[PDB]
DNA sequence: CGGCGTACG
DNA sequence: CGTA
DNA sequence: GCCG
């Protein structure tokens, strides 16, 4: 079992779901306390279990697995022996965890803001609504739309939405294309946001495109909230006899960068962090969603495909549905 | 022990 | 600070 | 918390 998540296929559904969920509770709780290293270890350990070919039934099966040490192994041991891990349950029922989780679900609210509100004594969404002086306009929109944004969108919704986005994009710039990225490209049937990547086959024609797209979507009445090359929005999505708010991200890239942007926005979040860590630490190359830089030659690798990028990093190709780290 | 994605709004 |  |  290789040490980086980008070195191993990770499917969306797997054979260790309960174990991985428990470790991800501990990862989440570490992040709420600002312990990013511990968050990464617990996330990586969870992802190792997602990549295994069969269920873990005995503690011996953890021997030699990367990112399993004393703590993660004890968590698994307790789940295997008793069906529950006391540490995980203590986290689940703690006021700190429950409130930090609730607050960081709000669009516009990160750990730092949530922690500040927690220390100020706030605990519920209504607590925040009663103090609107404390909220940015972004947080006000996230709070108003929180209920809708808590419910998953289906792939059928995504497809109808893509058609709406494509019409606006085609008026903004004929020939420009829209590609579905994010979790739905990785095979999810349900999800909580929708990601689209926009480009044009003629290098440079995409300059200035995103404002033109947003203005047209706004004119069509589809934008419930928006604040360039990335737009993090709340869209109005049709529902039987009504509608609901959905989180939608729109990104523009020049076609020369499209393989890097697609690889970037397809995720998963942990996959991306692991891939960029691997690139820098193992290959000495600096990766982002624009390109791949050799700091010794001071050159950029001109990729024509995601397959090109994996080859250049010396990795076996992973299709998007095996990037669910 | 140091390191832990790398950007953009 | 927030977003991915 | 774990790797190297
Ligand atoms: Br590609
Ligand atoms: Br980036
Ligand atoms: Cl830490
Ligand atoms: Cl590292
Ligand atoms: K948030």
End-to-end Cα separation, chain A, in angstroms: 14
Domain with CATH 3.30.460.10 in chain A: 152-255
Contact (Cβ atoms closer than 8 angstroms) between residue A103 and residue A123: no
A157 is catalytic: no
Resolution reached, in Å? 1.6
What topology is assigned to A256-324 in CATH?
Beta Polymerase; domain 3 (3.30.210)
Domain at A152-255, CATH from 3.10.310.40, 3.40.50.300, 3.90.960.10, 3.30.460.10: 3.30.460.10
Residue positions of A in the annotated binding site? Answer: 193, 195, 249
Of A136, A139, A134, the residue nearest A121 (C-alpha): A134
Q: How far apart are alpha carbons A254 and A196 in whole angstroms?
A: 14
**CATH 1.10.150.110 fits domain A1-94:** yes
Find the A125 Cα to ligand 4 centroid distance in Å: 38
A127 is catalytic: no
Domain at A95-151, CATH from 3.40.50.11740, 3.40.630.30, 3.40.50.620, 1.10.150.20: 1.10.150.20
The technique is: X-ray
Does the C-beta of A38 come within 7 A of strand D? yes
Q: Are strands A193-199 and A242-252 parallel, antiparallel or unpaired?
A: parallel
Residue positions of A in the annotated binding site for Mg(2+)? Answer: 193, 195, 249
3-state SS string for chain A: CCCCHHHCCECCCCCCHHHHHHHHHHHHHHHHCCCHHHHHHHHHHHHHHHCCCCCCCCHHHHCCCCCCCHHHHHHHHHHHHHCCCHHHHHHHCCHHHHHHHHHHCCCCCCHHHHHHHHHCCCCCHHHHHCCHHHCCHHHHHHHHCHHHHCCCEEHHHHHHHHHHHHHHHHHHCCCCEEEECHHHHCCCCEECEEEEEEECCCCCCCCCHHHHHHHHHHHCCCEEECCCCEEEEEEEEEECCEEEEEEEEEEECCHHHHHHHHHHHHCCHHHHHHHHHHHHHHHCCEEECCEEEECCCCEECCCCCHHHHHHHCCCCCCCHHHECC
Contact (Cβ atoms closer than 8 angstroms) between residue A42 and residue A24: yes
Domain with CATH 3.30.210.10 in chain A: 256-324
């Amino acid at each position: 079992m290789p040490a980086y998540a980008c070195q191993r296929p990770t499917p969306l559904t797997h054979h260790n779901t309960g174990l991985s969920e428990a470790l991800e509770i501990l990862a989440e709780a570490a992040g709420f306390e600002g312990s990013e290293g511990r968050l990464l270890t617990f996330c990586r350990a969870a992802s190792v279990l997602k990549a295994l070919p069969s269920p873990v039934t005995t503690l011996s099966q953890l021997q030699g697995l990367p990112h399993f040490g004393e703590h993660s192994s004890r968590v698994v041991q307790e789940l295997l022996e008793h069906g529950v891990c006391e540490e995980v349950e203590r986290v689940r029922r703690s006021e700190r965890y429950q409130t930090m989780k609730l607050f960081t679900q709000i669009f516009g609210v990160g750990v730092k803001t949530a922690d500040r509100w927690y220390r100020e004594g706030l605990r519920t969404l209504d607590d925040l609504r009663e103090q609107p002086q404390k909220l940015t306009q972004q947080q006000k929109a996230g709070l108003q739309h929180h209920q809708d944004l808590s419910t998953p969108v289906l792939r059928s919704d995504v497809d109808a939405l893509q058609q709406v986005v494509e019409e606006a994009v085609g008026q903004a710039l004929p020939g420009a294309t829209v590609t579905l990225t994010g979790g739905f490209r990785r095979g999810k049937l349900q999800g909580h946001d929708v990601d689209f990547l926009i480009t044009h086959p003629k290098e440079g024609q995409e300059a200035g495109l995103l404002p033109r797209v947003m203005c047209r979507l706004q004119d069509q009445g589809l934008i419930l909230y928006h604040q360039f090359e990335r737009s993090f929005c709340i869209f109005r999505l049709p529902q039987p006899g009504s509608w609901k708010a959905v989180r939608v991200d729109l990104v523009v890239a020049p076609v020369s960068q499209f393989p890097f942007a697609l690889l970037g926005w397809t995720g998963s979040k942990l996959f991306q962090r692991e891939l960029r860590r691997f690139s820098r630490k193992e290959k000495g190359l600096w990766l982002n969603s624009h390109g791949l830089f050799d700091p010794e030659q001071k050159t950029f690798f001109q990729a024509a495909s995601e397959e090109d990028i994996f080859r250049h990093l010396g990795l076996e190709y992973l299709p998007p549905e095996q990037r669910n780290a």
